[PDB]
Amino acid sequence: MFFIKDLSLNITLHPSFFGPRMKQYLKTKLLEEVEGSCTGKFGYILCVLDYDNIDIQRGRILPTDGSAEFNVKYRAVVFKPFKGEVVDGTVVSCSQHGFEVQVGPMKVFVTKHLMPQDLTFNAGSNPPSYQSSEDVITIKSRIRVKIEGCISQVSSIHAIGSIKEDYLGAI
Amino acid sequence: LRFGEMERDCMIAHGAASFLKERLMEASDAFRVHICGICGLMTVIAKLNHNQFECKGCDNKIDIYQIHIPYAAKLLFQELMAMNITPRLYTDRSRDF
Amino acid sequence: EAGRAALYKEVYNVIASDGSYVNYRHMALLVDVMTTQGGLTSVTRHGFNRSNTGALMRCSFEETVEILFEAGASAELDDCRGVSENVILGQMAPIGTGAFDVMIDEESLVKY
Amino acid sequence: RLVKALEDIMVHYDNTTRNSLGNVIQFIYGEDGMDAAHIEKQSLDTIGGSDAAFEKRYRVDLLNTDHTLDPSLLESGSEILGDLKLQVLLDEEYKQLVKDRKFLREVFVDGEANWPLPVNIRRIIQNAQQTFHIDHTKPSDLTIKDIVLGVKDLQENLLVLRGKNEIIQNAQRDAVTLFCCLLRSRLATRRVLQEYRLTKQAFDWVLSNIEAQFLRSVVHPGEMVGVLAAQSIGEPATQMTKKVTSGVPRLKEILNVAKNMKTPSLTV
Amino acid sequence: IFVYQNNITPSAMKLVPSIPPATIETFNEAALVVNITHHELVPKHIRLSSDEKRELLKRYRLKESQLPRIQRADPVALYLGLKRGEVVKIIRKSETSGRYASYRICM
Amino acid sequence: KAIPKDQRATTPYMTKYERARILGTRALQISMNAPVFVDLEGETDPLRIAMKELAEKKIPLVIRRYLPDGSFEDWSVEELIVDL
Amino acid sequence: VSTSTFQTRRRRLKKVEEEENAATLQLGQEFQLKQINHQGEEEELIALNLSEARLVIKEALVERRRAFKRSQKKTREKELESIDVLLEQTTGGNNKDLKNTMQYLTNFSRFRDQETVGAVIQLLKSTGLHPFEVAQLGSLACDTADEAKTLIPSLNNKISDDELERILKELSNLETLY
Amino acid sequence: GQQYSSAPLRTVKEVQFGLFSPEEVRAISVAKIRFPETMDETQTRAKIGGLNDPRLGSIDRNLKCQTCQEGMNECPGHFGHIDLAKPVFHVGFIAKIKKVCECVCMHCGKLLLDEHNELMRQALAIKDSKKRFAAIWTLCKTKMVCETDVPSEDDPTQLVSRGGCGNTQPTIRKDGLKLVGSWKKDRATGDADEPELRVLSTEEILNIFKHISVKDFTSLGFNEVFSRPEWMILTCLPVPPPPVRPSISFNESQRGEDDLTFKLADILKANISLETLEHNGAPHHAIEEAESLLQFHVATYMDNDIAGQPQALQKSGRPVKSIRARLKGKEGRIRGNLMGKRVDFSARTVISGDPNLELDQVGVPKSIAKTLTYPEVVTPYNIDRLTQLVRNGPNEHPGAKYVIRDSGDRIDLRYSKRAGDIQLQYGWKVERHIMDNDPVLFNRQPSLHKMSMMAHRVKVIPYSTFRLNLSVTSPYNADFDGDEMNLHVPQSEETRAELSQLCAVPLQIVSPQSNKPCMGIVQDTLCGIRKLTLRDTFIELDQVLNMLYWVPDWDGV
DNA sequence: CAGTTGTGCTATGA
DNA sequence: GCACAACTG
Ligand SMILES: [Mg+2]
Ligand SMILES: [Zn+2]
Ligand SMILES: [Zn+2]
Ligand SMILES: [Zn+2]
């Protein structure tokens, strides 16, 4: 998991910017668009690596308007979750239906039913928790989750997780 | 006024590629469509506002491009589809030469 | 080759008859085009319009619908190299002004 | 039909004439690579006349006292008589002009001299004269080497094709074959000195202009010769008004590659 | 090369491709009376070698498709016993250039 | 496939079509409030500025000359001969 | 316009099959083992353990902050506040994702020092496992070969029990303190 | 104009032609297209969710599209479908369908001839998709029996068993829209003498085509992804949205449906008869009767001008306009709407020759200059001029008609309450009047050569005629006996340049047609030039001075 | 192999 | 209003 990928974006510049701070503006636009971006193809496009060596290439003049299109070849850190992947995250939200574990830029949700029977919901607690004979899972809690599946929603990826199997759960 | 075939030829003869385009597009027909990248047809349901893209039947909500063709061409294409002919429009190549 | 030579002589003569002068090259180019294919090709739908050029281009002269029907059944692929295609497509054709591409170089842009 | 048959035909950046399939139609446009707008009917001098008057107009024998160039013609004249080394150059000059003559007579069998070619050499010379106020009385300051070799050099710079390889290089040689005959015909030693009465500068200037004028005369890649040629044949057909079928019906006959034609005939 | 007076039976004519790699040519005596290659209109055709052809296509960035053609059965193609794929160089005298080189590929 | 500089074999001179496209492009750009690499010595017409830019060879553009096979030779306006 | 890759495949009309993604190491087409870099060269996948990932991002932003100042010429809780500052100087701010990532990475990283991380990287990139498996052994803290082999299920027959357990023992020793 | 769309803007690089697989037709379909009734929710105006908008495109101009929201100028229209009650041939392919049957076994779907026949393997070699199919046909059409055992490539004594099926092959003849076979049979080696005669059903030919091997049909002209033979037979009919067949809506309470909308309602009608007919008590003859009719309506909708004469006519005698007809050249999509268009920023009037104009200029009547517009971007170099032109307005000559903001929204100076109090911002466009010295395309039809369309300098003049220099008469073929000429105004700085740099009158002077100049001194000037230049002709001081002054470049000497 | 029927076009703008 | 083109006899 957590990958480095060799991507490329196609930015179109308006003639007004055909000055010297051209490469500068293009590089910035790249970060504007691509950094913090989230696709399903590659997942979360987190940090654009090697700013100094971003390959601008030559920009082709688009015919009837005056603009120029560039293929900006780059390299960056991505995070694309997978089904069956084991993650170690921190509880954020927790309800009568289950808790939502924060794993990097993405949240994994554990269903009351994807946890062992021994773990029961406790409404009568500040903050709300899940209690067992031994373990107590509330907000700040750190958990080992098995990603059961992912849902590629727009500007994010969500997932459902299990803590029911072995070596999984509270850590 | 008609910028007919004969007048088209004259521009071709002049090598006035862009004047010719402007004459056929911007000064007439010019229209914008959304085509799918898988099936080369205008099947795309561009809800450009909610920024939703879709081409159901292709399940493609990703591989979509916008194109500027004369409305007459767009028509011709829909007319060919009505005749069971697929005028698959693609934005890249696979040939060389 | 002799057929080409004779074809020119015969073409030239129709123009020369009416006491007109046409530059060699033009007539040569026509004659050449009929000739190139291997034998004598007509300037009719049975002639040029039958070659392996882009379906869209060919449909623009005489067998329009028939040409387009064949295209589908034989899964023809138009190169989009022809003038006509670009004209149909509302694209800048690779003609004179469109025979090359133009690019900004950020190297020369910084030099000036 | 003419326009539709040729629409996609244009000159490419390799000086080739191709279509939408990139199939070669003419290897070099018009067989010469020249733009039709830059051509004028010029006289290929070398072609006609007696072998005697060709000799009178061209031959320079610095070894014969009656067939040398008079010191009246160039400063070098008096010191030029008997110079064996230079005679080798003039022998080449002559041998080439004779070669040229036989070649032209193979090309144009009828002996027609007037043909449309680039660069009006007559006009260049004319301007050189009014430009430099050429004194027809005073001798030239040109060397045989100046004239002989200067024309030899100019020839190498009449660039149509460019590639560095036998194939392309030979294509270039071929393309410029006729224009050179014209150039060699007009810029021969005797003509330059006795007729034109050119000075070193005036001559260098003539050569330099021929170069630019020629280079300027070549076709532009992108030139849409398809439509051009079609309109060039079509437009005069519009203007149209033994008894062998001619005019529009024969042209119809021709284009249609008609089998059962009106006036079949043999010229035995 | 078999020079035949009037005709060759279709029985015998089917035995022409029988012995490869060796090739057999049939020529009707009547055609050969006059050498067509000697005509005002008939230019020099030159058979290019495997190496020569390879160069022509290299130098012009060609596919064999792009080359102008000569049919196998073309009078001059027959005289030179040209095979499919073989290329010829044609030298014509130009009223434009003096000398012009065309190229034809066999069909 | 991109023919390297040392191998380029197209004219070293700028075509009529090239010039027309360069002048056209720069004028369109100049008019689109783009930066001008010349002293407008009272110039106001984007074409007249584009012309001045070409005359002083301060146009930052490259002509991508395509060959029938697909390959290309890139040439700078700076380097092209404008004898036209 | 969205982002594109090195991979070129021309899937003409042939929409689907779009294969399931599981650690049966059947990752994406995009996340194949055998891949291409911007320079056309073939190059094996790059997967990172949290800390390998932490130092990469940190370093990237550090050299970026240098370039942003160049052109302008004319302890975990203590590392958390430090990064939160670096982000404010190099990131678009609106990138709440990298902010959350950096926090997560700071808090869940097993090895603080580059030297330490390099040793881990060497120790693991010798087993000849898949970049993903190698990442998980560096990311997930395991004590049994069974702990490991259950959580990184792909491992199964690929490595020996005792071999894996030796590696775990070594990773436990390299485990940077707090 | 049209709204911003995120979607990456590209150009069509390739056009991959093919045929619709019903599966696709259904998949791309936003509706099906169940009832011939156009609209009127039973007499109640609004489209029926059943034909022409059961999601589809949209009528009303008001009221957005049901699937996408966009509306009229934006919504391209969305395809529907009708599931046909029985398979039908596509008119355009009837003969290919026949030629394909004539090349394959009409029982097992195996190519009649194969790798074993020397002439067949010779034809099978043909690289060209089309010629290869043609060569195959000429060979397989003769073959009348599906062979099971063929004489081996080494020896004809010990024959080899190739593909199965021994069935005899029919002799196919087209009885217009119907393909009828004539199997010779066998009967004591004699017969026929009296053959077996039956119509080949669409469905049987369909099953035969579905059994043709990928390799077998790929040897034929066909493609396994884009054009399988079975797709020449129509099972699922795509419904083209309203933009293809619009409803010309006069007033509020009145219809006006397209021809295609009627022919579709007929296909619809014919289909429901066939559907209920077969589902219920099938009187079998009435089944082949309603079928043949649907075959007719699907045929006529595509092509109407067929061999077997009955033209499908609308009750008015008027034959119903086929989609095929819509495309057929000089007028009709290709030739009429695409190789040529009627264009905006164009003008036409009577011409008259002026000796006071310059060769490259053109006299443009004020009213024309007042209509025609150049879209000019607000730049520091022009800002002030453009403001005065805006101030001047649409009625004064040097003026303007519209101010276009960055917002893309047009300010009509003609009416706008802020037409006076308006301040231009860099980047806006002022659509100004055509002014003196603008490059314009001027042309005289026919337009046989390049020179019949040339670029000229504007000169805004009074009176209603286009004025031109007499020496530019010949290139155009103009006479002032009542000729009219057309004018085109470029809208881009790029476009103007193309005209001024490539097609200007001074450039066109020496023509490549005959390597000579195509313009010279004419008429009065020619007649008079001889007259002035005789040796006998002398001029006294007084007139010499006017004659000099008149030459605009004269050195004052 | 030859005979008849079969097919698709017929200037540009007002 | 004609000029091949292709199927059938
Ligand atoms: Mg008139
Ligand atoms: Zn699709
Ligand atoms: Zn819609
Ligand atoms: Zn069978």
Curated annotation (Swiss-Prot), chain A:
<dbReference type="GO" id="GO:0006368">
    <property type="term" value="P:transcription elongation by RNA polymerase II"/>
</dbReference>
<dbReference type="Pfam" id="PF03876">
    <property type="entry name" value="SHS2_Rpb7-N"/>
</dbReference>
<dbReference type="InterPro" id="IPR045113">
    <property type="entry name" value="Rpb7-like"/>
</dbReference>
<protein>
    <recommendedName>
        <fullName>DNA-directed RNA polymerase II subunit RPB7</fullName>
    </recommendedName>
</protein>
<dbReference type="InterPro" id="IPR005576">
    <property type="entry name" value="Rpb7-like_N"/>
</dbReference>
<dbReference type="GO" id="GO:0005665">
    <property type="term" value="C:RNA polymerase II, core complex"/>
</dbReference>
<comment type="function">
    <text>DNA-dependent RNA polymerase catalyzes the transcription of DNA into RNA using the four ribonucleoside triphosphates as substrates. Component of RNA polymerase II which synthesizes mRNA precursors and many functional non-coding RNAs. Pol II is the central component of the basal RNA polymerase II transcription machinery. It is composed of mobile elements that move relative to each other. RPB7 is part of a subcomplex with RPB4 that binds to a pocket formed by RPB1, RPB2 and RPB6 at the base of the clamp element.</text>
</comment>
<dbReference type="GO" id="GO:0001172">
    <property type="term" value="P:RNA-templated transcription"/>
</dbReference>
<dbReference type="GO" id="GO:0006352">
    <property type="term" value="P:DNA-templated transcription initiation"/>
</dbReference>
<keyword id="KW-0539">Nucleus</keyword>
<keyword id="KW-0240">DNA-directed RNA polymerase</keyword>
<keyword id="KW-0804">Transcription</keyword>
Swiss-Prot record, chain E:
<comment type="similarity">
    <text>Belongs to the archaeal Rpo5/eukaryotic RPB5 RNA polymerase subunit family.</text>
</comment>
<comment type="function">
    <text>DNA-dependent RNA polymerases catalyze the transcription of DNA into RNA using the four ribonucleoside triphosphates as substrates. Common component of RNA polymerases I, II and III which synthesize ribosomal RNA precursors, mRNA precursors and many functional non-coding RNAs, and small RNAs, such as 5S rRNA and tRNAs, respectively. Pol II is the central component of the basal RNA polymerase II transcription machinery. RNA polymerase complexes are composed of mobile elements that move relative to each other.</text>
</comment>
<protein>
    <recommendedName>
        <fullName>DNA-directed RNA polymerases I, II, and III subunit RPABC1</fullName>
    </recommendedName>
</protein>
<comment type="subunit">
    <text>Component of the RNA polymerase I (Pol I), RNA polymerase II (Pol II) and RNA polymerase III (Pol III) complexes. Component of the RNA polymerase I (Pol I) complex consisting of 14 subunits: RPA135, RPA190, RPC40, RPA14, RPB5, RPO26, RPA43, RPB8, RPA12, RPB10, RPC19, RPC10, RPA49 and RPA34. The complex is composed of a horseshoe-shaped core containing ten subunits (RPA135, RPA190, RPB5, RPO26, RPB8, RPB10, RPC10, RPA12, RPC19 and RPC40) where RPA135 and RPA190 form the DNA-binding cleft.</text>
</comment>
UniProtKB/Swiss-Prot annotation, chain F:
<comment type="similarity">
    <text>Belongs to the archaeal Rpo6/eukaryotic RPB6 RNA polymerase subunit family.</text>
</comment>
<dbReference type="GO" id="GO:0005634">
    <property type="term" value="C:nucleus"/>
</dbReference>
<dbReference type="GO" id="GO:0005654">
    <property type="term" value="C:nucleoplasm"/>
</dbReference>
<dbReference type="GO" id="GO:0042790">
    <property type="term" value="P:nucleolar large rRNA transcription by RNA polymerase I"/>
</dbReference>
<dbReference type="GO" id="GO:0006362">
    <property type="term" value="P:transcription elongation by RNA polymerase I"/>
</dbReference>
<comment type="subunit">
    <text>Component of the RNA polymerase I (Pol I), RNA polymerase II (Pol II) and RNA polymerase III (Pol III) complexes. Component of the RNA polymerase I (Pol I) complex consisting of 14 subunits: RPA135, RPA190, RPC40, RPA14, RPB5, RPO26, RPA43, RPB8, RPA12, RPB10, RPC19, RPC10, RPA49 and RPA34. The complex is composed of a horseshoe-shaped core containing ten subunits (RPA135, RPA190, RPB5, RPO26, RPB8, RPB10, RPC10, RPA12, RPC19 and RPC40) where RPA135 and RPA190 form the DNA-binding cleft.</text>
</comment>
<dbReference type="GO" id="GO:0006383">
    <property type="term" value="P:transcription by RNA polymerase III"/>
</dbReference>
<keyword id="KW-0539">Nucleus</keyword>
<dbReference type="GO" id="GO:0006368">
    <property type="term" value="P:transcription elongation by RNA polymerase II"/>
</dbReference>
<keyword id="KW-0963">Cytoplasm</keyword>
<dbReference type="GO" id="GO:0003899">
    <property type="term" value="F:DNA-directed RNA polymerase activity"/>
</dbReference>
<comment type="function">
    <text>DNA-dependent RNA polymerases catalyze the transcription of DNA into RNA using the four ribonucleoside triphosphates as substrates. Common component of RNA polymerases I, II and III which synthesize ribosomal RNA precursors, mRNA precursors and many functional non-coding RNAs, and small RNAs, such as 5S rRNA and tRNAs, respectively. Pol II is the central component of the basal RNA polymerase II transcription machinery. RNA polymerases are composed of mobile elements that move relative to each other.</text>
</comment>
Swiss-Prot record, chain H:
<feature type="binding site">
    <location>
        <position position="78"/>
    </location>
    <ligand>
        <name>Zn(2+) 1</name>
    </ligand>
</feature>
<comment type="similarity">
    <text>Belongs to the RNA polymerase beta' chain family.</text>
</comment>
<feature type="binding site">
    <location>
        <position position="481"/>
    </location>
    <ligand>
        <name>Mg(2+) 1</name>
    </ligand>
</feature>
<feature type="binding site">
    <location>
        <position position="108"/>
    </location>
    <ligand>
        <name>Zn(2+) 2</name>
    </ligand>
</feature>
<feature type="binding site">
    <location>
        <position position="479"/>
    </location>
    <ligand>
        <name>Mg(2+) 2</name>
    </ligand>
</feature>
<feature type="binding site">
    <location>
        <position position="146"/>
    </location>
    <ligand>
        <name>Zn(2+) 2</name>
    </ligand>
</feature>
<feature type="binding site">
    <location>
        <position position="105"/>
    </location>
    <ligand>
        <name>Zn(2+) 2</name>
    </ligand>
</feature>
<feature type="binding site">
    <location>
        <position position="65"/>
    </location>
    <ligand>
        <name>Zn(2+) 1</name>
    </ligand>
</feature>
<feature type="binding site">
    <location>
        <position position="165"/>
    </location>
    <ligand>
        <name>Zn(2+) 2</name>
    </ligand>
</feature>
<feature type="region of interest" description="Lid loop">
    <location>
        <begin position="246"/>
        <end position="258"/>
    </location>
</feature>
<feature type="binding site">
    <location>
        <position position="483"/>
    </location>
    <ligand>
        <name>Mg(2+) 1</name>
    </ligand>
</feature>
<feature type="binding site">
    <location>
        <position position="75"/>
    </location>
    <ligand>
        <name>Zn(2+) 1</name>
    </ligand>
</feature>
